[PDB]
């Protein structure tokens with residue numbers, strides 16, 4: 385009965401705001417007018433991106449920004465709300481460029497959350513910016529607070545949330561109350577910086593939007609799918625950094641939660657979240673990419689999957705060889721490594737040499753260019769069927785995606801997601817989810833329902849014995865135990881009544 389959220393980033397850079405126009409796509413490729421009223425109906429949230437934190441340790445626009453043209457752009461977005469009384473125009477603070485460990489504004493993120501007074505000043509600047517520009521809530525996209533900073537970051541979300549609540553009461557906005565989201569890490573390495581405090585991070589949020597993409601990159605040594613839903617045994621596996629987080633769990637508890645190595649996948653990151661106590665399924669939103677990542681230098685035999693490769697990893701892209709054949713946007717943006725779905729469709733349709741292939745374990749598509757040795761990992765309306773069924777089945781809150789201008793012109797990716805959740809005539813009850821590798825970790829937050837005979841005092845239990853006691857089902861870790869379950873370390877809690 386609750387509508388799945390559908391959260392779409394709208395990114396526009398300072399130069400384009402300052403030269404804003406809706407009638408010249410070589411100045412602004414994706415102007416607000418491209419968000420038609422039928423698109424506005426399919427979205428629950430649009431994430432205007434990106435604001436920053438300045439050296440005053442306040443949320444601010446980039447200072448080169450033309451303020452009147454910024455307001456004009458935001459007003460066109462907030463005007464969309466007339467087609468959809470559920471729709472929110474959020475704004476987003478951060479992104480990779482601003483907030484990465486080596487980003488130009490990084491120190492500001494660190495310092496803004498560092499003390500109580502600085503959090504109060506930061507928090508106030510967020511709401512004040514929200515109210516002044518007419519936005520409907522705040523999304524924080526710091527990539528990423530480190531374990532030392534995370535208590536500051538949490539405090540900062542708490543205080544912002546208090547100020548959003550005051551503000552909803554002052555504006556009478558209980559029918560569409562002001563909201564707080566974050567863009568969360570979607571792979572265990574980054575996730576491990578804050579994983580041990582996930583319940584605290586998510587509690588003040590309406591949603592944690594997982595970046596369950598960018599899970600392969602030039603930075604890995606072997607090509608892979610950047611957003612595989614489930615795992616492929618023929619693909620690479622990785623060290624599970626969460627087994628080293630500061631959780632205070634036992635070896636058995638750690639081992640059962642965090643198999644290692646493991647398959648880097650959407651499913652994995654979602655289960656990683658569900659394992660933790662006090663992270664509800666309904667606040668978890670699955671990110672999907674509206675773009676592919678492209679590799680060169682590959683030798684297939686397997687469609688260019690799981691191949692060594694020669695893709696530069698530097699930033700900026702370090703030369704002018706735009707090798708991604710038929711990628712015109714790539715030339716425009718001076719980087720062949722990232723191609724929008726809108727462009728990939730045109731590459732596949734033209735005579736550029738690609739085949740579209742499908743991995744039935746990962747439930748994701750891929751292009752392969754056999755004559756030049758290219759491999760592209762992307763998502764389409766077909767991969768979205770499986771991800772949408774997963775969202776419904778796992779009782780997740782919705783889907784988030786980056787970014788709106790990467791949809792094709794007709795908006796088919798977005799229409800597909802709206803349809804899989806909301807169309808009466810769409811049936812996925814027979815959609816086969818396949819036999820790819822599921823992440824099987826179990827933690828305190830996702831214990832299965834189980835039954836077992838009642839624990840009996842005096843009985844000598846062997847290894848593996850299952851009993852039920854004080855609301856749970858417990859298993860002995862070795863034999864022969866006679867202790868009451870929960871009273872010492874012999875018993876592992878494995879399930880709930």
Ligand SMILES: CNC(=O)NC(=N)NCCC[C@H](NC(=O)Cn1nncc1CO/N=C/c1ccnc2ccccc12)C(=O)N(Cc1ccccc1)Cc1ccccc1
Nearest residue numbers: 395479480481525567595598602603697698699721722786
């Ligand atoms: C909602 N937030 C996000 O979705 N964040 C996000 N995807 N962050 C990672 C972004 C890295 C990206 N950069 C690259 O991917 C460049 N690149 N391509 N191949 C290699 C590189 C170099 O950067 N690698 C970043 C990276 C990203 C993720 N994990 C890593 C792990 C180890 C090392 C590096 C990474 C980037 O900075 N830009 C392009 C881009 C943004 C979003 C999605 C895909 C691409 C710049 C940009 C442009 C317009 C608007 C905002 C941001």
Ligand SMILES: O=[P-]([O-])[O-]
Nearest residue numbers: 573574576577625
């Ligand atoms: O570089 P990292 O383990 O967050």
